[PDB]
Every structure is written in C-alpha cells, then in structure tokens.
Amino acid sequence: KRPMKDIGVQQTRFDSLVLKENIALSMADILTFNSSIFVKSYGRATLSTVSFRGTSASHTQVTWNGMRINNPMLGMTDFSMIPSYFIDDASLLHGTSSVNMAGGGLGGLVKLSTVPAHQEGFGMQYVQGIGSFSTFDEFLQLKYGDKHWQISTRAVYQSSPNDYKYRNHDKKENIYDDKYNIIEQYYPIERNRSGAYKDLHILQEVYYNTGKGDRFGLNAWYTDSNRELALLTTDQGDLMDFENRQREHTLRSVLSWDHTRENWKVSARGGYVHTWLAYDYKRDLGNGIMATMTRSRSKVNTFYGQLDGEYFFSDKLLLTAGVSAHQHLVNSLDFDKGRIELSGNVSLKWQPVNRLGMSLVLRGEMFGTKWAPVIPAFFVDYVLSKRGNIMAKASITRNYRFPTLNDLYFLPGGNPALNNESGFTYETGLSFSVDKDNVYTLSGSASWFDQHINDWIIWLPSPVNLKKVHAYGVEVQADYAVAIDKAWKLGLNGTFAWTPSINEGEPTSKADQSVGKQLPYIPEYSATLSGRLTYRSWGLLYKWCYYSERYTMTSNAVSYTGHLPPYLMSNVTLEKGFSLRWADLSLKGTVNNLFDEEYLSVLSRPMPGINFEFFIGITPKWG
Amino acid sequence: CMKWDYGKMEPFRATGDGLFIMNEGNFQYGNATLSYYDPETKKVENEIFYRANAMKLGDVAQSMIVRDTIGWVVVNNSHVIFAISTNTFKEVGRITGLTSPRYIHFISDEKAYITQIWDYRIFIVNPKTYQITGYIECPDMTMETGSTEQMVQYGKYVYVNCWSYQNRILKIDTTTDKVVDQLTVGIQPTSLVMDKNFKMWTITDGGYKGSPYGYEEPSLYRIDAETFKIEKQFKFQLGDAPSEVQLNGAGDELYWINKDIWRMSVDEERVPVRPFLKYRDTKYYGLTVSPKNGDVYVADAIDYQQQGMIYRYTEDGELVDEFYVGIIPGAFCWK
Ligand code: CNC
C-alpha cells in the first residue's frame, strides 16, 4: 500500500481542489482553514507567522522545489506572499518527519513544488475577481505541450486600497464647543488607513522528457510587491502625510535533472534566488517637501545545489543518500557577509515482514564554520489489523537548529559566539480507513507527540539562549465523503490539535510569573472543519476555523488592554459552472465573515466585517 | 460561535498624595497603560486610564507632567498627549497631530514646548486652544536622526539634550524662540536635570556596539548654568548603560541606575564606592525619589513582556513594599 519512502511518517497532503479553489487565497489562508497549524495574521495581504506544534516561526522550514525559502536574515517565511494558484503540490511534514528532508525543522517542514502538466496542444485560462473594498484580482494561465515539451506561464495581480469601515472600540472622539470642553464622546466609525497594496507574481516553467529515463526542468518565479503598513487601532488624529511601504523584488529559479533506471535513480538539482528589500517611512511637511524618517535597504543572493540518490536492493530493502549546499551571500546595506550551509543524509528502509517496517536516518550539517552533532531518526510502522487498516506508528529523533544570520551578525547586538538549539522528540499514533462499496469513505488518525526544546534563542536586554520549552499534545484529523443520492455528494474534513507549550526555564529574577505558563501567541486548542456539497453543476463550500485564547503576556495574567478572545470564523462559497460553445464559464461568489463579527485577532489591529467577492473564469475550448 | 469587545467606565475618586506610573508597554501592540499607587494605604490601581475612560491609552507612553490638578500624559507612538484630571482620571482634552513626541515642558500658562524623535523641529503648542503655534529648528539636525528629549529652564533660557544619534545639548531663548548656543558632550546624552546650586547634570550612553557613531565610554557631566564650560567629567568604563540621573525633592542628591543603583550628592567629588543598593540579580529599568519622605522606588521590568514590579526602599535602604504594574514601567510622576 504505502510506498517504502512513507514508512512511519506523519504528514498531511493538500490535494488539488483545496489549493485551486480560489485565486485570492495565499498559503496563509490555506494553512489557516485546512490544517491544525496556528497562523498569526491580522488580515489579508499582511505578515503571516506560522507556529507549528507549539514552536515559533523560526522552527518551521519551507522548501520550494527542494530549495529552502526562509529569509536567511530573519529565519521565517511570510506565507502571505505565496499565491495558492502558484503551488501545484503541498505537503506538511510533522515533527520528526522533517528530518527526512531538512535540518533544523524543530517544528516541521512545509514542502512546496510545481508539477508538470499533461496538456496536448495549446490552452489558456483567465480568471477575474471583483469584491468589496475596491479589491481586484486577476490570474492568467498559458500552457503548451507536445509529448516532449511542457511550457507554462502564470501571472497573478492583486490590488486594493483597504479602506474598510470598522467600529472602533479602543478610541473615543470628543465633541468640543466654543470654549474647548468635551460635551459628548462617541465611538467613531473609521476606515483602515495606510493599508493599500499591489502585488505582481509571474511564474514560468519549461519541462522536457526524453522518455528514456531523463527528465529536465526549469522554473522561474518573480515577485513584485508594494504594500503599506496599516495604522494601529489606538492611533490618534486625522494623520495624513504619513506613508509606510515595503517593496520587495525577488526571483526564484531551480534547475532539475532526473535520471531513472531499473532499481536505482539519481536526481541533480540547482537554483538561485535574488531578493531586494526596501522600507520607507516619510512625512509630508511644509507645502511640498516630503522628509524621510526611516530608510532601509537589503539585498540577498543565494546559490543552491543538491544531489540525491536512491537504490533498491530488493522490494523489501532500500537505500538513499543526498547532499545539499546553500550559500547565503548577504549584502545588506545600511553588514555584508554570509554563510555556507552543507547537509548530508543516509537512510535505510527495511521491510522484514509484511506487517513490520523500520527506517533509520542519519543526517549531518555544517553551517558556515561550525559542525553540528549527528541528527539520528528512527521510524517504525506496524499493522495492527488488515480489516480496518488499523496501523500503528512511532518515531524518535534529536534535532538541532542553527542560529539565524541576524542572531550572529547584526548591527546593534551581534553576538557571534552563540549556540544552536536542540530538540528531543518522540511520537506515536494510529490510523484507519474503512472504505466501503462506493457508499462512504472514512479515514483519520490520532497521534501523540512529546518534544523538549533546549537552548532556545531569544533576544532580551541580543541573543541570550536559555528558554527551555516543553511542547507536547495530541493531533487528530479525519476525512469523510458520502453520496446521499445519485446526484448529491457531501465531504467533511476536520482537524483538531491540543498543543500546550510550557516553558521549563529557571525563573529569571524573582517576580517571574512565567514558569509553567503557556507561551505568548500560541493557542492551546485549534480546530478546522471544511464541508463541500455538490449537486450537478452547483457547489457549496463551508470553511470554519477555531483558535483558543492567545495570551499576549508570558505570565498569562488577566488584563483589560491585552485580552484576545477565542477566534471563530466562517466562510461560505457558492459556485456555478456553465458550458458554452467556445469557452467554459465558472461563476462563484465568496462570503467571508459570514456572521459579521466585530473582533480583533491581533492586538490593536482592526479587521473587516462581512465582505464579498465574485469571480469569473473563462477556459476556451478548441479542436 | 461569535466574538465581541466593548468597554465600561468606572468612577475613580482617588485622593491623597499618590504616585503615577507610566507603563510603556510593548511596541506596535498598543498595550501602554497607566497606574496609580497610594503610599499611605499601600494600594495600587492598574489601568486607571482605560478603566475610567473605556478606551486604551495608546502605544509607548513616555512621560507625564502634573500641573495643578491636570496631568499631561505624552504617548510616543500615538502622536498624542492626553490631558487628564489627577483626581478622577477623566480626560480633559488631547493634543494630537504630532510626530512621535518625547517630552513636554510648560514655560508659561499659554505656551509649551514639545520635543520629538525622528524630527528636527521642536513643537510649540497652546495648552488651552490645543493647537500648534510654531516650530523651533535645531541647527545641524537632520530628519533621519533627529532627537531632543528633556527640557530644563534657567531664567529666560530652555536647555535640551539630543539623545538619539546625537552628542549635543542646545540652549533656547524663550523670548525670541531661537537656538542661541550649543554645547558638545559624549555620544547620546540621555537625560538632563538641574540641581539646587544651578548646575546641569547629564549622562551619556555608550552606544550598544555597532551604532554608526560607534561606542564610547559612558560618562557623566556637570555643565554649569550661566556659562556652559564643561566643568567636570566622570568616567564609567565600557559595558555599562547608565541613564536616568533625576534628583530628589530637595534637588541636592543624584540617583542613576548604572547596574548598581548609585547615590551621589551635589557639590561633591568623584563617584563613591558603596552603592545605595549593590546588586540582587535584578534588571532595574527606572527609579524615582519621593519629595515628601525620601523613599526610593525602583522599577523592575523582568523580561519586558509581563507585568513589572516596583520595590519601595527607605532612605536607609530597607524594603517596605513591592507591587505589580503594567508592562515595562518607564517613568514616575507625583500627584
Ligand atoms: C533596549 C532597547 C529598547 N528599545 Co530601542 C531603545 N532605547 N533599542 C533597545 C536597545 C537594544 C535592542 C536593539 N538592538 O534593538 C537599543 C538602544 C540598541 C535599541 C535601539 C533603538 N531603540 C531606539 C528607540 C528610541 C526606542 N527603542 C524602544 C523600542 C526601546 C524598547 C522599549 C519598548 N517600549 O519596547 C527597549 C527598551 C526594549 C525592547 C525589547 O527588547 N523588548 C522586548 C522584545 C519582546 O521586543 P521586540 O519587539 O522583540 O524587540 C525588538 C524591537 O523592539 C527592536 N527595536 C528597538 N527599537 C526599535 C526601533 C525601531 C524603529 C524598530 C523597527 C525596532 C526597534 O529591538 C528588538 C530587536 O529587534 C523605544 C520604544 C524606547 C523609547 N521610549 O524611546 C524607542 C522607540 C521610539 C520611537 N517612537 O521610535 C533607537 C532610535 C535608539 C538608539 N539610537 O539607539 C534605536 C533604533 C534602532 C535603529 N534601527 O536605529
């Protein structure tokens, strides 16, 4: 059933209709409503932070076509800048499973890739989206194929002013009189300010297949972003002449070569990424002069190469090896230096009997000039019962994460002599699948994980290490699909995660009420539920997300000005498809914030009420 | 399956000679808050501004000035200075339309100077019409690294220091509203105070290695009032970040953190060796001295992301009290 590579591995797979369901969704929205991951984002087209299994953002690695995507200076990825329509395949490697491909993925790994199409001749697609607040979305697809070549081109453009009206509960405007006294105070109905944005993404793919076992590929991805940083809720006055801007130009390229044979296979790969960052903070004073108060520029160049192998001694024994190299040449204007990163791994997969299965992974790393202890990993898989496919899993590892480039080389606070975090993990879980005779398909899993973080890197008046953290909990997910009638289909996907994140560090000072406390901005509970109903050409989709209370203080103390209520959101989409002569029409209307909540997900960050969105999709048909 | 957030007011009736604590809060969180402490009954009220007004204070509260029964709370990251009553904590007004103000200084009942960071101008406001009535241009000051922090007046002049990315203190003539003379000190003079015998005390930060001006030994100065000169300079050795050299009620005794809380007298000589409070593995962020009895309050910020604690010590040095306030207690003011 399962492939030899997937032995004793806990992961979740995003299928095509989840990713290709809407052109306005970034990967932050995909992970929010389709997985138990916590995503910290105060709206649309804004910084999104992923906390995976009770860890920080720096503990989650992102790879696009095998090349790591995390910003080397910050160590974290902004998931809001990755359109879902630019991703054809996504996987989520949980905990120990991240060791199978990456290094310091203490939380986990997010594996993104682009898949070759199967198009004969020429074809194209155009989708246009119109919604509230004067938002506009466009997406254009061009492709061609002739059984050896596969050329594709995509473009995504998104723009909006972000001037939604919200009722402000954190500020009171006062009505004066002839002698400057407050007579009445009312909660104003303001609009989001300094929130406009314009994004451009272009993706180009060229694929070649000799048909003799050699496959070549080339992907190029260009990003042009122009976003403004919104004002806080507690910001006073009609403050015009104040602009924030974060321009961001970036190019990702990967070259791939695959050489396959009877039982063995070798894959070579190389890439290059260039990034240019620009932050502005200006004020218009006087009459026409616009003085500048903050100006930051940064340029990052990275070269990537990788070589993988795989050998089959038989159908019940397997060997893999691989070497990876990254070189982050950073020339940040306003320190200019970088790191060389090497990783190698050798793995043995063995299937001694039909039920039992074992796997052993050995990985070594060397970042710049400092080696790391060998990272081992053992995965074991056993089949408790063939009837209901009840299966048991277990794993264990000792993972290490290197400090980011700012933790090492930075202008105000640049400690070079910094240790690397370590984490000891062990997991166990069960799974099942009760597929019946085309009536329903129910499958799910439940896994327990216990993980210890040591030498966590934190800045406090500057890396100071410390911060021992204990992360554990239970993950549950289940899928269901039943055909009520010959024309009605229902699908339910639900996930749940109880993820305490307790810090066990020695009490700093004497009044530290933080030992044994939940970490800030990490919910203890999370749940998602997605329902899809299909009737001929009609389709109704329901998305629901639940986050428990998120604490803004390490002491978890009750405060009036720092309280975040549990987050519950509901989105509904209705889609209708028509079949014309020279084209196919797909109409869908999206309703976000169905119940019109006046809420606050991130402290002092206003968020819109009920808003709408309407899409038109045209796919020409030819001979 | 729904979410909500409102607010409700509360009738505070604070009396006695209390102490106001301005909790800065974190940065781009909007959790700055104000606290009140009563030294007689040892009772502390947190979040007095929000509780009595049903609205948040703002972001990064910096300082506060009490004139008669009206206190002016300046909020840095919200471009606002709130005017509240010191007996009910009700809002009496606001000054809005500033560019990250630092401090306010009233030179007359109809005029007041406000100093900003990231600006080369010193605002002039009317504390009654609530409007800006002009600006003061600091020479050789650029918008990129503009900074002026604290005001002390001496007769017809006003003295300021230029902290962030600056090494200069300026003298302003209030009659003509112009900068008349300049003085040069070490890198980043943090705070400026005046004593009973008319000698300004300023203390210079180190630099926090990496800064464009580079690092320099933190120092202490005793600039004279009438004529600038430099009179005397003190050396504090590298690896330290001293600041907040405010005086006592009588204005004849110095107090600065510099790791071990020091206590120096005016018209004296080189720094003593015995600290007022040697060290008890605490992270002291700010302090104040009571003008009534002489008790010394020191603020502990712990880890900058939780409720801080203030310790109350007598003039001798014995602990009397300790209590919790908002996040990062930054400054103190006496009702
Ligand atoms: C100690 C500290 C603090 N800082 Co500095 C001071 N003194 N800071 C530092 C020191 C070390 C930290 C560092 N290397 O950045 C010090 C002096 C080097 C530093 C730097 C600066 N700081 C500055 C200022 C004045 C401020 N700083 C505070 C944030 C003032 C803080 C007070 C406060 N109210 O928050 C503060 C007391 C505690 C921050 C903290 O660690 N929080 C705990 C942690 C959870 O927070 P965090 O968000 O993860 O921390 C990061 C940021 O706060 C950042 N940061 C600090 N200052 C800034 C300014 C900007 C524009 C940005 C984008 C980030 C920062 O530092 C951390 C590392 O990235 C400030 C609110 C204090 C105040 N009331 O004056 C104020 C912001 C004022 C304003 N309206 O802009 C400087 C201009 C001073 C200077 N010239 O050295 C400078 C700006 C940096 C630059 N790019 O030029």
PDB file of N, CA and C and ligand atoms in Angstrom, chain A residues 410 412-413 459-462, chain B residues 24-27 60 62 76-77 100 102 117-118 149 163-165 188 205 208 211 285 303-305 328, ligand 1:
ATOM      1  N   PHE A 410      24.765  41.202  13.348  1.00  0.00           N
ATOM      2  CA  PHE A 410      23.762  42.258  13.311  1.00  0.00           C
ATOM      3  C   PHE A 410      24.312  43.494  14.006  1.00  0.00           C
ATOM      4  N   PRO A 412      23.124  46.528  15.965  1.00  0.00           N
ATOM      5  CA  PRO A 412      23.044  46.723  17.432  1.00  0.00           C
ATOM      6  C   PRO A 412      22.759  45.428  18.195  1.00  0.00           C
ATOM      7  N   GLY A 413      23.813  44.645  18.407  1.00  0.00           N
ATOM      8  CA  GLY A 413      23.693  43.348  19.044  1.00  0.00           C
ATOM      9  C   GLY A 413      23.997  42.234  18.067  1.00  0.00           C
ATOM     10  N   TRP A 459      15.882  37.166  22.264  1.00  0.00           N
ATOM     11  CA  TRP A 459      16.515  38.465  22.470  1.00  0.00           C
ATOM     12  C   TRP A 459      15.845  39.158  23.647  1.00  0.00           C
ATOM     13  N   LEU A 460      16.654  39.571  24.622  1.00  0.00           N
ATOM     14  CA  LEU A 460      16.187  40.349  25.748  1.00  0.00           C
ATOM     15  C   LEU A 460      17.383  41.134  26.277  1.00  0.00           C
ATOM     16  N   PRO A 461      17.244  42.452  26.466  1.00  0.00           N
ATOM     17  CA  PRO A 461      18.298  43.311  27.014  1.00  0.00           C
ATOM     18  C   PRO A 461      18.771  42.865  28.395  1.00  0.00           C
ATOM     19  N   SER A 462      19.677  40.957  21.268  1.00  0.00           N
ATOM     20  CA  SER A 462      20.820  40.322  21.913  1.00  0.00           C
ATOM     21  C   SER A 462      20.505  38.882  22.303  1.00  0.00           C
TER      22      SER A 462
ATOM     23  N   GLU B  24       5.199  51.733  29.744  1.00  0.00           N
ATOM     24  CA  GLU B  24       5.390  51.940  28.313  1.00  0.00           C
ATOM     25  C   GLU B  24       4.664  50.890  27.489  1.00  0.00           C
ATOM     26  N   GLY B  25       4.659  49.646  27.942  1.00  0.00           N
ATOM     27  CA  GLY B  25       4.095  48.594  27.135  1.00  0.00           C
ATOM     28  C   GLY B  25       5.046  48.234  26.009  1.00  0.00           C
ATOM     29  N   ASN B  26       4.611  47.280  25.196  1.00  0.00           N
ATOM     30  CA  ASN B  26       5.427  46.837  24.082  1.00  0.00           C
ATOM     31  C   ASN B  26       5.233  47.764  22.886  1.00  0.00           C
ATOM     32  N   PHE B  27       5.792  47.367  21.749  1.00  0.00           N
ATOM     33  CA  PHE B  27       5.967  48.251  20.608  1.00  0.00           C
ATOM     34  C   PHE B  27       5.178  47.675  19.437  1.00  0.00           C
ATOM     35  N   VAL B  60       3.414  53.024  23.736  1.00  0.00           N
ATOM     36  CA  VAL B  60       4.670  53.554  24.261  1.00  0.00           C
ATOM     37  C   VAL B  60       4.446  54.886  24.966  1.00  0.00           C
ATOM     38  N   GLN B  62       5.487  57.666  27.464  1.00  0.00           N
ATOM     39  CA  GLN B  62       6.856  58.082  27.736  1.00  0.00           C
ATOM     40  C   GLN B  62       7.001  58.824  29.058  1.00  0.00           C
ATOM     41  N   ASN B  76       4.157  58.305  22.912  1.00  0.00           N
ATOM     42  CA  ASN B  76       5.128  58.469  21.836  1.00  0.00           C
ATOM     43  C   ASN B  76       4.581  57.953  20.511  1.00  0.00           C
ATOM     44  N   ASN B  77       4.245  56.670  20.452  1.00  0.00           N
ATOM     45  CA  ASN B  77       3.885  56.025  19.197  1.00  0.00           C
ATOM     46  C   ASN B  77       2.437  56.257  18.789  1.00  0.00           C
ATOM     47  N   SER B 100       5.693  61.642  16.906  1.00  0.00           N
ATOM     48  CA  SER B 100       6.362  60.883  17.957  1.00  0.00           C
ATOM     49  C   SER B 100       6.939  61.808  19.022  1.00  0.00           C
ATOM     50  N   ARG B 102       8.309  63.224  22.592  1.00  0.00           N
ATOM     51  CA  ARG B 102       9.030  62.649  23.722  1.00  0.00           C
ATOM     52  C   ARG B 102       8.614  63.264  25.054  1.00  0.00           C
ATOM     53  N   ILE B 117      11.219  62.728  18.443  1.00  0.00           N
ATOM     54  CA  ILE B 117      12.256  61.921  17.827  1.00  0.00           C
ATOM     55  C   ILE B 117      11.888  61.763  16.358  1.00  0.00           C
ATOM     56  N   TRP B 118      12.904  61.511  15.533  1.00  0.00           N
ATOM     57  CA  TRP B 118      12.748  61.465  14.078  1.00  0.00           C
ATOM     58  C   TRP B 118      12.209  62.787  13.539  1.00  0.00           C
ATOM     59  N   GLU B 149      15.182  65.350  23.837  1.00  0.00           N
ATOM     60  CA  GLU B 149      14.466  64.583  24.855  1.00  0.00           C
ATOM     61  C   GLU B 149      13.946  65.411  26.023  1.00  0.00           C
ATOM     62  N   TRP B 163      19.465  63.117  22.274  1.00  0.00           N
ATOM     63  CA  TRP B 163      19.920  61.782  22.645  1.00  0.00           C
ATOM     64  C   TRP B 163      20.221  60.913  21.431  1.00  0.00           C
ATOM     65  N   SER B 164      19.201  60.586  20.644  1.00  0.00           N
ATOM     66  CA  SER B 164      19.338  59.519  19.660  1.00  0.00           C
ATOM     67  C   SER B 164      20.213  59.976  18.501  1.00  0.00           C
ATOM     68  N   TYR B 165      21.343  59.294  18.316  1.00  0.00           N
ATOM     69  CA  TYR B 165      22.292  59.604  17.249  1.00  0.00           C
ATOM     70  C   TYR B 165      22.719  61.067  17.297  1.00  0.00           C
ATOM     71  N   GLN B 188      25.266  60.418  22.704  1.00  0.00           N
ATOM     72  CA  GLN B 188      23.915  60.151  23.188  1.00  0.00           C
ATOM     73  C   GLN B 188      23.702  60.539  24.646  1.00  0.00           C
ATOM     74  N   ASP B 205      25.107  57.868  27.047  1.00  0.00           N
ATOM     75  CA  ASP B 205      25.043  56.438  26.814  1.00  0.00           C
ATOM     76  C   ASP B 205      26.306  55.957  26.108  1.00  0.00           C
ATOM     77  N   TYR B 208      26.028  50.753  22.412  1.00  0.00           N
ATOM     78  CA  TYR B 208      25.476  49.435  22.089  1.00  0.00           C
ATOM     79  C   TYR B 208      26.078  48.895  20.787  1.00  0.00           C
ATOM     80  N   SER B 211      26.594  50.780  16.494  1.00  0.00           N
ATOM     81  CA  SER B 211      25.952  52.038  16.131  1.00  0.00           C
ATOM     82  C   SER B 211      26.872  52.874  15.246  1.00  0.00           C
ATOM     83  N   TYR B 285      15.122  49.161  35.560  1.00  0.00           N
ATOM     84  CA  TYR B 285      14.825  49.949  34.370  1.00  0.00           C
ATOM     85  C   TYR B 285      14.618  51.428  34.657  1.00  0.00           C
ATOM     86  N   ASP B 303      11.258  40.720  32.063  1.00  0.00           N
ATOM     87  CA  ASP B 303      11.602  40.282  30.714  1.00  0.00           C
ATOM     88  C   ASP B 303      10.894  41.101  29.641  1.00  0.00           C
ATOM     89  N   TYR B 304      10.411  42.295  29.990  1.00  0.00           N
ATOM     90  CA  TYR B 304       9.877  43.262  29.036  1.00  0.00           C
ATOM     91  C   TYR B 304       8.589  42.803  28.366  1.00  0.00           C
ATOM     92  N   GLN B 305       8.066  41.642  28.747  1.00  0.00           N
ATOM     93  CA  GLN B 305       6.810  41.167  28.179  1.00  0.00           C
ATOM     94  C   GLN B 305       5.929  40.552  29.256  1.00  0.00           C
ATOM     95  N   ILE B 328       6.590  47.004  31.367  1.00  0.00           N
ATOM     96  CA  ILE B 328       7.733  47.913  31.271  1.00  0.00           C
ATOM     97  C   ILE B 328       7.417  49.251  31.930  1.00  0.00           C
TER      98      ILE B 328
HETATM   99  C1  CNC C   1      16.726  48.050  24.880  1.00  0.00           C
HETATM  100  C2  CNC C   1      16.010  48.515  23.642  1.00  0.00           C
HETATM  101  C3  CNC C   1      14.677  49.062  23.664  1.00  0.00           C
HETATM  102  N1  CNC C   1      14.274  49.957  22.826  1.00  0.00           N
HETATM  103 CO1  CNC C   1      15.108  50.817  21.366  1.00  0.00          CO
HETATM  104  C4  CNC C   1      15.896  51.903  22.777  1.00  0.00           C
HETATM  105  N2  CNC C   1      16.363  52.534  23.602  1.00  0.00           N
HETATM  106  N3  CNC C   1      16.562  49.618  21.498  1.00  0.00           N
HETATM  107  C5  CNC C   1      16.850  48.770  22.567  1.00  0.00           C
HETATM  108  C6  CNC C   1      18.365  48.582  22.617  1.00  0.00           C
HETATM  109  C7  CNC C   1      18.701  47.150  22.159  1.00  0.00           C
HETATM  110  C8  CNC C   1      17.646  46.426  21.283  1.00  0.00           C
HETATM  111  C9  CNC C   1      18.054  46.550  19.834  1.00  0.00           C
HETATM  112  N4  CNC C   1      19.294  46.223  19.496  1.00  0.00           N
HETATM  113  O1  CNC C   1      17.247  46.947  19.002  1.00  0.00           O
HETATM  114  C10 CNC C   1      18.836  49.694  21.664  1.00  0.00           C
HETATM  115  C11 CNC C   1      19.152  51.061  22.272  1.00  0.00           C
HETATM  116  C12 CNC C   1      20.034  49.223  20.787  1.00  0.00           C
HETATM  117  C13 CNC C   1      17.662  49.761  20.745  1.00  0.00           C
HETATM  118  C14 CNC C   1      17.711  50.511  19.584  1.00  0.00           C
HETATM  119  C15 CNC C   1      16.937  51.619  19.335  1.00  0.00           C
HETATM  120  N5  CNC C   1      15.884  51.995  20.085  1.00  0.00           N
HETATM  121  C16 CNC C   1      15.527  53.320  19.799  1.00  0.00           C
HETATM  122  C17 CNC C   1      14.424  53.915  20.317  1.00  0.00           C
HETATM  123  C18 CNC C   1      14.296  55.384  20.705  1.00  0.00           C
HETATM  124  C19 CNC C   1      13.415  53.132  21.020  1.00  0.00           C
HETATM  125  N6  CNC C   1      13.588  51.922  21.406  1.00  0.00           N
HETATM  126  C20 CNC C   1      12.398  51.375  22.116  1.00  0.00           C
HETATM  127  C21 CNC C   1      11.655  50.391  21.194  1.00  0.00           C
HETATM  128  C22 CNC C   1      13.036  50.596  23.282  1.00  0.00           C
HETATM  129  C23 CNC C   1      12.318  49.395  23.890  1.00  0.00           C
HETATM  130  C24 CNC C   1      11.155  49.827  24.784  1.00  0.00           C
HETATM  131  C25 CNC C   1       9.757  49.395  24.420  1.00  0.00           C
HETATM  132  N7  CNC C   1       8.815  50.199  24.804  1.00  0.00           N
HETATM  133  O2  CNC C   1       9.544  48.336  23.798  1.00  0.00           O
HETATM  134  C26 CNC C   1      13.502  48.696  24.609  1.00  0.00           C
HETATM  135  C27 CNC C   1      13.729  49.369  25.979  1.00  0.00           C
HETATM  136  C28 CNC C   1      13.127  47.218  24.821  1.00  0.00           C
HETATM  137  C29 CNC C   1      12.834  46.445  23.525  1.00  0.00           C
HETATM  138  C30 CNC C   1      12.735  44.946  23.796  1.00  0.00           C
HETATM  139  O3  CNC C   1      13.768  44.277  23.803  1.00  0.00           O
HETATM  140  N8  CNC C   1      11.528  44.446  24.003  1.00  0.00           N
HETATM  141  C31 CNC C   1      11.347  43.012  24.269  1.00  0.00           C
HETATM  142  C32 CNC C   1      11.045  42.230  22.979  1.00  0.00           C
HETATM  143  C33 CNC C   1       9.926  41.238  23.186  1.00  0.00           C
HETATM  144  O4  CNC C   1      10.627  43.155  21.989  1.00  0.00           O
HETATM  145  P1  CNC C   1      10.840  43.014  20.439  1.00  0.00           P
HETATM  146  O5  CNC C   1       9.840  43.815  19.734  1.00  0.00           O
HETATM  147  O6  CNC C   1      11.028  41.599  20.099  1.00  0.00           O
HETATM  148  O7  CNC C   1      12.284  43.713  20.308  1.00  0.00           O
HETATM  149  C34 CNC C   1      12.794  44.265  19.104  1.00  0.00           C
HETATM  150  C35 CNC C   1      12.319  45.662  18.842  1.00  0.00           C
HETATM  151  O8  CNC C   1      11.734  46.399  19.861  1.00  0.00           O
HETATM  152  C36 CNC C   1      13.594  46.331  18.371  1.00  0.00           C
HETATM  153  N9  CNC C   1      13.646  47.753  18.364  1.00  0.00           N
HETATM  154  C37 CNC C   1      14.069  48.579  19.331  1.00  0.00           C
HETATM  155  N10 CNC C   1      13.988  49.866  18.989  1.00  0.00           N
HETATM  156  C38 CNC C   1      13.475  49.881  17.701  1.00  0.00           C
HETATM  157  C39 CNC C   1      13.174  50.944  16.833  1.00  0.00           C
HETATM  158  C40 CNC C   1      12.664  50.608  15.588  1.00  0.00           C
HETATM  159  C41 CNC C   1      12.322  51.712  14.611  1.00  0.00           C
HETATM  160  C42 CNC C   1      12.459  49.248  15.216  1.00  0.00           C
HETATM  161  C43 CNC C   1      11.903  48.920  13.852  1.00  0.00           C
HETATM  162  C44 CNC C   1      12.752  48.216  16.062  1.00  0.00           C
HETATM  163  C45 CNC C   1      13.259  48.569  17.299  1.00  0.00           C
HETATM  164  O9  CNC C   1      14.546  45.809  19.248  1.00  0.00           O
HETATM  165  C46 CNC C   1      14.294  44.400  19.286  1.00  0.00           C
HETATM  166  C47 CNC C   1      15.241  43.664  18.376  1.00  0.00           C
HETATM  167  O10 CNC C   1      14.782  43.709  17.003  1.00  0.00           O
HETATM  168  C48 CNC C   1      11.581  52.683  22.428  1.00  0.00           C
HETATM  169  C49 CNC C   1      10.064  52.429  22.464  1.00  0.00           C
HETATM  170  C50 CNC C   1      12.025  53.324  23.762  1.00  0.00           C
HETATM  171  C51 CNC C   1      11.653  54.792  23.920  1.00  0.00           C
HETATM  172  N11 CNC C   1      10.517  55.080  24.514  1.00  0.00           N
HETATM  173  O11 CNC C   1      12.424  55.673  23.497  1.00  0.00           O
HETATM  174  C52 CNC C   1      12.031  53.649  21.301  1.00  0.00           C
HETATM  175  C53 CNC C   1      11.083  53.791  20.080  1.00  0.00           C
HETATM  176  C54 CNC C   1      10.791  55.261  19.885  1.00  0.00           C
HETATM  177  C55 CNC C   1      10.022  55.672  18.665  1.00  0.00           C
HETATM  178  N12 CNC C   1       8.864  56.264  18.728  1.00  0.00           N
HETATM  179  O12 CNC C   1      10.593  55.397  17.610  1.00  0.00           O
HETATM  180  C56 CNC C   1      16.688  53.928  18.967  1.00  0.00           C
HETATM  181  C57 CNC C   1      16.460  55.029  17.921  1.00  0.00           C
HETATM  182  C58 CNC C   1      17.778  54.391  19.994  1.00  0.00           C
HETATM  183  C59 CNC C   1      19.185  54.393  19.505  1.00  0.00           C
HETATM  184  N13 CNC C   1      19.581  55.341  18.717  1.00  0.00           N
HETATM  185  O13 CNC C   1      19.989  53.508  19.852  1.00  0.00           O
HETATM  186  C60 CNC C   1      17.287  52.658  18.299  1.00  0.00           C
HETATM  187  C61 CNC C   1      16.600  52.348  16.956  1.00  0.00           C
HETATM  188  C62 CNC C   1      17.252  51.210  16.180  1.00  0.00           C
HETATM  189  C63 CNC C   1      17.708  51.708  14.814  1.00  0.00           C
HETATM  190  N14 CNC C   1      17.487  50.910  13.813  1.00  0.00           N
HETATM  191  O14 CNC C   1      18.242  52.788  14.722  1.00  0.00           O
END
